[PDB]
């Protein structure tokens, strides 16, 4: 065709979702605790649950040896601390860059620019899989518009990224995605591109998708209640009491439930991975001072803290983050130990 | 799945562009109104790339009367202005638009929507008129870009990763507006990221998912819509070519005069001209396009009356006619 | 995988249904045309099927002039005869050859079949909005799809009457279907296609998204027996009367379709005038069961070998326009002697 | 589309390719199989093809035991024969009937052809995982792209011997192809079917990801005529030197498998074994045309009816009778006997 494809070097071709989930069927046990982490996270949006909603893991999978041991060491958490928090893992495989940069473990796997993204998913999907299967819920951020379809039935909550907030095509799909969907505030600090959001998505929306037969398609969905807002900073953090109090008042504005997840890092950590612990001690103060509105939390952990560069080419270091810097485990027990801690306060 | 109500079958884009093929004389101008977008985008053309139109096409019939009065002041305004007719077929925010919803009645006749806007580029096409698009989302553009000769990324989805992928793979120029705050740093940040080659999931003219690898998008440049205040004047557009020098771009700004710049005040599109004339009068090279909201008749409606917009408020033809001949004298004082 | 050697995009069907889509001419022959087969397949009418046209068309613009002279026979001849031109794209080879012009649409190896098929539907397109039905056989089982819209009559070949999945397409067609028989003769195996087609079936094919899929089908009540030939010719009363005999012990309607040419010719176009004159004589004398012919024609006589010299078929030999001419009038006054 | 009543999505060949990929030993097995018939259809070996098993395949558990049991023998006799299972899944008949294990693996009429793509597959990958190669039939063109990487032999239906649909589908295939005789015991429309199969051929078809497409193939040389019987059995040595002076007169290697049930055995199970009689006394004699033989074989015996409501027989046909396994044992060691007698 005349004026078509200047831009396009190569067009390859990608196993249709069907194929996935064919070849990686989820198991009962899979499946039971992907449907019972999105109704306990269902019945805490609705005020019925006095827990705390914890997405906690690395910034970005990179290993799935490295990701499997720290779900055992992160389900044991959730067994123990099971009265005061519901913890799900981040299990993030599609990661946004401000500019340029390895896009994730479905882009890249080999992290050698050899996008080989069918083994991307084939590994995606297989890990999700297995982590479910031993009894540990998993979150996901939904960036691209394809890859949900080959991996949100595995997914108990999901995050649509500050960059794609007042995305119309994300707020879409948020709008027919089987999960609870946080909206982060906009890069900025602001608030009401996640309002917005939140009350786009549920409402029901009818726009142009693909199936899990790799097929474009009319695609009509019924709108998604369980969306709530995530608070990751501004030019400056927004997880204190003032910020709070503030959208708070929002969200009651806008007719919306006062409810806030608060990421501990990114902005709200000012990109310092330590900063988390600080952020997390004035969480906990607020938490266990009464504060009925701060319903999850999400913080960047992985095994050994800090990161490391793939562009060196040296060998990378086991269970350390390639992407933004992650607090390591023994800060995670403790983060969770003190989250626990201060939930507990708050109901007694 | 539990979110999912109903899933409808979509025509491939293969079977609108066998229906609907581009002619000759269509494919001529969609070739040369990119190569003359590129030329002035490389600087080795003192031309300004105009584009001007309805916020956005409710109807074909008035659209194709628009295109034929425009028609007219490109080829009269030729040497000093490349007329390419805006033809954007939603609003982002109501009616979802002339391709999600054709008739106006919640219908949501997408497949009859895309033969209606198809139909009507590649008849604006074939007349000699070129069109600009607005690039909202990763599956229409198959359908309609080989028809386009230059594209707006939706000011909600500068920051959108998957946007800039999608630009960057592109046959056309693309503009990128600048934050809602007026900062510049979103759209430097898509124009880099817009540049370089990326590997992603699409969906091909034959409605299948695909890995597709791109090889990035020179041709990319910033629009200002404005923030809280207007920034199209002088001071504004200094600030602008120095943030773009020190980002290692080329100093180069297209001014929307609608929107924020116009203060929400249609008429107010004029005024913008009046200064954004002086400025290229005056020597300005860096402002290589311009973006104007007209239609037939001025103002705008609520879903009636014949060539106004039910949209956002245009101006109408008798001040397009001014607007479009003030900007050729300037660009002409510029040439010296 | 080691035995294929390219794997090449194909347009989907909605793609040659959007570009050319049924006017409303060509919409109303074809309905017309297959009521009025159903008509006269239910005995509810006394005129002849007459399936008549090129072996294959290679050539659209030769086409089109055949099909305005036959159109014109066709309004003059309408009391007696229901006229429909052979408009065929798919030739079943013994062996290898030129598979016709869906295939091959340039004859010189180069299966061009997104040319081809643009080609067909749009001559069938024009064609039909002419007013003249046409008639192909269903030999490929991906095809279909881009063409039966505007066919108000198909053909299963001898070398397929037996093939399952032929069986199952006609049982999902749109239009009537004539079985030929068996190339040795066998008539058994006609009447076997003829009551699978009439059944619904479950099987895999592909739809007009071009994707496969599981498709179910009712069946197809207008179906019927083509008379061919074998080793000697079937056409004459004996063997009519035989095959309407077998008809009735299978519980199917006493009626035949007559091909004049291949076997029952001795594969000798001119013989084609010798079995009219038989066929006449059975209709003139009586013969009800008659209800369809088939005859290979084209603008000159005979075949050539695969530039080409205009109006001959590259296929079969084929009778002539002036032949073709007095062959139509000949059925036709055959079914006013009957009637 | 007035008489299309429904249309149900289909899993794509590679849905079932990514659920059920091919093993190491898997595929091992098939490529040496292949290698293993393309040489003695060549010539350069003088082992007897062997393809035994079911009728029609209903059960996989009994499958799988028949597949260990035939293992065996193939292991053993290996030096005289290449034992191949036979692993068809339907009986086609213009008849009503159970429409086999793909179309209906429930065998209640629920048409779930999904289930049976998956079950059929399942199946072929853990008999050739075994070590044991795996001989299809080719009913449609459909369903071959789920399952042909699996098979080392496949045969074309008797009933589309002369359709150039199928002969189309042979030139593409990766594996050897058996071209059965006409109803009438002749062998012209299956010469011309190996002649048609042996040439390049561009068609329409679908690929593995479920999408019609254009198809180029290289034609198929391991092409060979099956002899099944006619109005009377043509396994005998007149027929054989018949068949023998056709296939040279055409240009054709002068080679012939000889099914021995249905026709052959005027449709009596326990037949097949004085077909093995006459056709053991060909190879030792000398015979070296007959490069492969086709044997119906069970666990069980016999065959059974399939009943609503009802348990069936394990290891016994629901479709044509077969001979069982003692037979099928004493068939084996004749056969091996004779090829060793010829050498
Ligand atoms: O995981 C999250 O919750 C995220 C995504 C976030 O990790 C992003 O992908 C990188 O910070 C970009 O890194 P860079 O700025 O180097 O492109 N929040 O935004
Ligand atoms: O059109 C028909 O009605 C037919 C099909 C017929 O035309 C066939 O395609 C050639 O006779 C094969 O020619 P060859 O024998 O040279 O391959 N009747 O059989
Ligand atoms: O294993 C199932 C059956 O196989 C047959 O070959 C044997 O004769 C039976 O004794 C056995 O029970
Ligand atoms: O970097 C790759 C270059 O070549 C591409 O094909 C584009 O035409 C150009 O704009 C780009 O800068």
Request: glycine share 8%; hydrophobic share 40%; aromatic share 6%.
């Amino acid at each position: 065709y005349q004026n078509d494809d200047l831009r396009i070097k190569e067009i390859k071709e990608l196993l249709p979702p069907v194929a996935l989930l064919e070849k990686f069927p989820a198991t009962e046990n899979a499946a039971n605790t992907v449907a019972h982490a999105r109704k306990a996270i269902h019945k805490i949006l609705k005020g019925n649950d006095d827990r705390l909603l914890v997405v906690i893991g690395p910034c970005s999978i990179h290993d799935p040896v490295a990701a499997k041991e720290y779900a055992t060491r992160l389900l044991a958490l959730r067994e123990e601390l099971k009265d005061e928090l519901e913890i799900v893992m981040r299990v993030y495989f599609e990661k946004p860059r401000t500019t340029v940069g390895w896009k994730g473990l479905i882009n890249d796997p080999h992290m050698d620019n050899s996008f080989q993204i069918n083994d991307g998913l084939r590994i995606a999907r297989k890990l999700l899989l297995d982590i479910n299967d031993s009894g540990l819920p998993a979150a996901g951020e939904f960036l691209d518009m394809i890859t949900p379809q080959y991996l949100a039935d595995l997914m108990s909550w999901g995050a649509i990224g500050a960059r794609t907030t007042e995305s119309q095509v994300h707020r879409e799909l948020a709008s027919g995605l089987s999960c609870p969907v946080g909206f982060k505030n906009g890069t900025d600090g602001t608030i009401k591109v996640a309002i917005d959001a939140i009350n786009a998505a549920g409402a029901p929306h009818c726009f142009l998708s693909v199936t899990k037969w790799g097929h474009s398609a009319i695609v009509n969905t019924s709108g998604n209640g369980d969306c709530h807002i995530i608070l990751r900073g501004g030019k400056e953090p927004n997880y204190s009491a003032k910020h709070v109090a503030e959208v708070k008042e929002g969200l009651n504005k806008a007719g919306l439930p006062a409810q806030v997840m608060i990421d501990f890092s990114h902005a709200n950590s000012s990109k310092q991975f330590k900063k988390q612990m600080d952020v997390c001690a004035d969480v906990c103060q607020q938490i266990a001072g009464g504060e009925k509105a701060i319903i999850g939390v999400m913080v960047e952990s992985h095994l050994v803290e800090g990161n490391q560069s793939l562009e060196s080419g040296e060998p990378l270091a086991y269970g350390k983050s390639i992407t933004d810097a992650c607090i390591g485990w023994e800060d995670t027990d403790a983060l969770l130990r003190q989250l626990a801690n201060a939930v507990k306060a708050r109901r007694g």
